[PDB]
Amino acid sequence: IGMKNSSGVVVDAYIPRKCSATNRLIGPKDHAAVQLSVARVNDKGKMIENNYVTFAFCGAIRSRGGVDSAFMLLAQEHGLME
Amino acid sequence: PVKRRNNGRSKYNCGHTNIVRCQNCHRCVPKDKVIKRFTIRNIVDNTIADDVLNACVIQGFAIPKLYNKVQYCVSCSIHNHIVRVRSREDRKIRTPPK
Amino acid sequence: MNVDLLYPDPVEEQRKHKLKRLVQGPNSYFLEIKCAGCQDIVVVYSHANTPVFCPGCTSQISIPTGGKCAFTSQVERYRQ
Amino acid sequence: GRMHSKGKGISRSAIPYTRAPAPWNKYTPEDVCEQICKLAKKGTPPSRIGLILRDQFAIGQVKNVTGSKIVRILKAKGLAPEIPEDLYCMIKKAVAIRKHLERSRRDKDSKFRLILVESRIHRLARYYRQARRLPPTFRYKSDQAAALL
Amino acid sequence: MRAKWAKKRMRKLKRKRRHMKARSK
Amino acid sequence: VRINVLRDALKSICNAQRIGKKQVIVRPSSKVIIEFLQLMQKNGYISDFAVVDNHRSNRIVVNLIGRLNKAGVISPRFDIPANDIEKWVVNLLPSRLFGHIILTTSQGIMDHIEAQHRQIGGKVIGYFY
Amino acid sequence: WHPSTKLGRLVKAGKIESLYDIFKYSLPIKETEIIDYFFPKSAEEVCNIMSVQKQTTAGQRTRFRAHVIVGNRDGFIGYGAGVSKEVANAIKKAAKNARLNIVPVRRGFWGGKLGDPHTVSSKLSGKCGSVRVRLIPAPRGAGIVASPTVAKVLEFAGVSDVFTRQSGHSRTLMNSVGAVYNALKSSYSILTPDLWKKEHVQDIRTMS
Amino acid sequence: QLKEADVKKMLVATTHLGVRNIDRRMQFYIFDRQKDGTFVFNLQKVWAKIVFAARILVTIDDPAEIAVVANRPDAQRAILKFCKYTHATAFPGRFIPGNFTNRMNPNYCEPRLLLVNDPVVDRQAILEASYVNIPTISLCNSDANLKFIDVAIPCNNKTPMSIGLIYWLLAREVLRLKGSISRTEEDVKPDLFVA
RNA sequence: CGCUGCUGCAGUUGAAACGCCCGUAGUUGGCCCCCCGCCGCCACGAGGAAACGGGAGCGCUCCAGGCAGGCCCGUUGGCCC
RNA sequence: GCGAAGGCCGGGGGCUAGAAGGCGAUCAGACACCACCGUAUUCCCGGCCGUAAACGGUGCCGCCCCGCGGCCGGCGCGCGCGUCCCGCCGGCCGCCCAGGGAAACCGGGAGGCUCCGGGCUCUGGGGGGAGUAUGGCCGCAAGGCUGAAACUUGAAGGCAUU
Question: Which pairs of positions does the record mark as disulfide bonds (chain A) (predicted)?
């Protein structure tokens, strides 16, 4: 990722996360944006497995209210929780 | 500024409405903008209703009601307190209050 | 639900207008129907507005309507 | 949008994807072409010839069953309308409003509809004259329209 | 209605002016 | 009347991205819109585009990955000299390195960067960044 | 320094470091101390001060409005606004707000890609009231081509090359400065093909 | 993972019956309509919601950092029982404007993730949570705005028995998913949660 | 001065949508055939005055200049418009 | 070609209101408002006129565009089945998330526009002078349509807030 310089080393600086659902860069002042994590579980003795898939949703997505449907959809297509 | 979306009138899909006159002022007012409060009252006041009801020699006749649609011009309505000047916030309310 | 486009729901497509659809298609069909006098089946449009006469009883079997043609005599159902 | 009105409506006809003849239908191209020819003997207009084939016979689409449209069948037999039906139907309407106007001189609304209908007859005639489906000599006037119908 | 009253005043001047031009033809 | 098919298609593409949807349907299919989508797909702005056969004028379902900011059409198709393919770049797109103007040329409908190397000039179809 | 917000505690702790990692997580900063901890820059300039009045039974009541732009000379810009009955107090509120809204600037190349980033990363657009601003990437020799107020914001930003176009009542400094700030603030949310690749313990607020 | 005889659990809860107005965002969770007008949710979709809220819940490391809010009087006993089982801070009645955006608010708080009983009267909590990057998880009936609500749980929210039960099913799973309590076994009847 | 707006203005209330409808010029036209004929189009050609402008070389003491100069490409005075 | 009202012309008609006129009360003065009487008018037929805050102060055709309603006219679906229910198309609308805008607000646009280019017409370019002068065309007239300049001036105006 990053804006590479002619020498082949990224110059840029901080790299913003992109919202999982709509791929709009989460901006520095996107205070509304949140990045919750869903816990994978074992077959039986369901327990936190020490690794959480990480999912980001920007505030514009949040305002639409689409995050809840997109979040459910995101797990089912990606498997993971659903 | 435009005070009301309605424009003070209920004209929708029309260019002209039938004129009516203020009952008090006699100003010609398009039917859409008239205040139009219908009233169903009693032929005599309640204070006289008891005495008239006792007076009648007929077996079961109630004081017969009077039905009139009062239509008022805007000025006649605000002066006679039929309608009140409200705040920009409450101006939107449409339900008959009180 | 992951329901998407290019492969859409048939029931959902029917409710949508014939031309506002991925493929604009007829909303009308042909009807196999059987008259009281004659047991042979006459194929008729579902929305015939034309006066249509039975091949048997002289009177027309088609009553024209705003949508689907109503019938006056005996009725069969579902053309095959 | 309607040419002469501020009205928007869509009530079209949706031809099927299949351009091939239906299985239940038992009419050969000659069988329906014969019906088209006898319907021309009755004088029925091609819009009605197409409707009659659709409902009394089961040929909902003529071009699917045959290889050509009703007027192509007629033109091959040289039995097509001399004045294309669309113009002719407008001309009937223009004379019908004009007849009513002769009795009533105060129907300004009726007069207005005449200007719109007449304007279509002129517009369709210029296209028909350019295509040569109409003789170039043809002119729709108005007073002489009664004879033209 | 000062605009409607200005137009009427303009008209009663233009008619006077039109009369004056007519005296000299 | 529907004079510019491309404009309607590209505004629908950009409106669907602004809400954020995975598939959009374009009401009229034109071989020029199909080529425009292809140039964008090769560059990676968009994904698969599917042309449903209406048997009338056809439709297109374009899959949106979410990376397109503004895609537009310059109407009238104006005539761009080769010594002006650079003038259009600064007026229309953001940064010389990012963004693509498609211009039709006798050689074909190609992005400006390719045309600039070929030393050719054509007629602009539209800007996708 | 007494920290209050989780970030304020972590910054003093050294658990959370570099403003760039708080901007990545897009979190608000509620204490100017966090900006002071990150930046030991010895640049803060008050861009104009304006007297404002409210008619009352007495008459006009004068308060002053001050706008201060503070910028680490390269990569982060902050513009802040504040009010009070005396100008000095208002300048403090505006300057503490200016730090409490310090934002990153992407800074890319006009096309001379080689060493240091010299220009805005793409066309930058900002709108405050009527004022609408466009910052255009420019060749290295060509400098900051802008009006003296919007040029100060660009120096404090450290964008060496920029062609700026300002349209509106640009005479309103609050709006002109705001519009350039808005353009620079959104520089880090526009997708470019170089950020098209994809990607809990790493999270900044995960620390608990 | 719906079990056997919900008739004495979620169907006894009346969690399925929702409201007479349906939001577009709640259409998937809802199924059929009764002639009187009520819309009835689908219970396995609510099980897939119960475990899903639990997944975000077992992600946060300190449960007291997670908070839970309600303004509904019937809700008070339920949130408190949820506070007794999982150790999560309570926010009874008014959330208080500026609780999350004013340091000078005497109770300035910063919950890692928020839980709101409904977007009907616990709406301020969802608005403020947006300003400070705080996720929102909420139980929702059919007429529910999902604006700023990151995850939603179809939940009657009308019956006190339904509000309490939703929480008991939710509370059991988060303890079972952390593993702190046993899982997949034969405990309190949610009647303690309901008031 | 984007207060003339091709780029690039504005017209609900700041100035400004004709009261409406038909309508000729004018302007604008859905999708559609891979292969050429004429277009426009675009690329590069020739061929076209210098001055000027841009530009090569050159210390008029610097300079505005001027084509000079140095034992020298066929020493220059190119080349672009 | 049509085009409210007022007006005009040649006839009919003439109840009601009622420009003008007259009048009683006012008030410093009202000749005005208010009361009373009242001519043109109102109304009809045959022509003129060509104007209105002729308004949604929003040209026309085309596209996508977010929910939740009401009404309206067709059409179809379900069910035992009722002017029920769900849709579809077309019209009238309310509220509105984004989006936009100087805001008011608009969102069936005033959105998809400084990130500025779907097509066509019309109009504006600080305030006045002035919609005047003059010429033209048109009308019986009233006037309509077109339409300046000399000259004067630092604001006029929009929408918000105390």
Answer: 19-58
Q: Do residue F75 and residue F103 come from a single domain?
A: yes
Number of domain units in chain F: 2
Q: With CA atoms as reference, report the closest residue to D123 among D107, D134, D112.
A: D134
| F interface test, pick of C4, C6, C12, C17 with most F CB neighbours within 10 Å | C6
Q: Which domain holds residue F128?
A: 69-129
C-alpha to C-alpha distance for C18 and C16, rounded to whole angstroms? 7
Of F68, F90, F113, which residue is a domain's last? Answer: F68
Point out the domain boundary residue: F45, F68, F91.
F68
DSSP letter at C7 equals S
Which residues on adjacent β-strands are paired with residue G46? Answer: G68
DSSP letters along H69-82, please? Answer: EE--HHHHHHHHHH
Indicate the residue type of D61: Q
Whether the bond between C51 and the residue before it is cis, its omega within 30 degrees of 0, is no
- The verdict on F89 and F61 lying in the same domain is no
Please state the domain count of chain H.
1
The answer to whether strand I lies under 7 Å from the CB of residue F17 is no
Method by which the model was determined: cryo-EM
Question: By a Cβ cutoff of 8 Å, what residues of chain A touch chain H?
Answer: 31-39, 41, 44-48, 52, 57, 59, 62-69, 71-72, 75, 81-82
Interface of F with C in 41-100 (CB under 8 A): 50, 52-56, 59, 61
List the subunits that have 3+ CB pairs under 8 angstroms with B: none
Q: What is the resolution of this structure in A?
A: 3.4
Cα–Cα distance between H8 and H4 in angstroms, integer?
10
Domain range enclosing H163: 6-195
Largest CA distance in chain H: 53
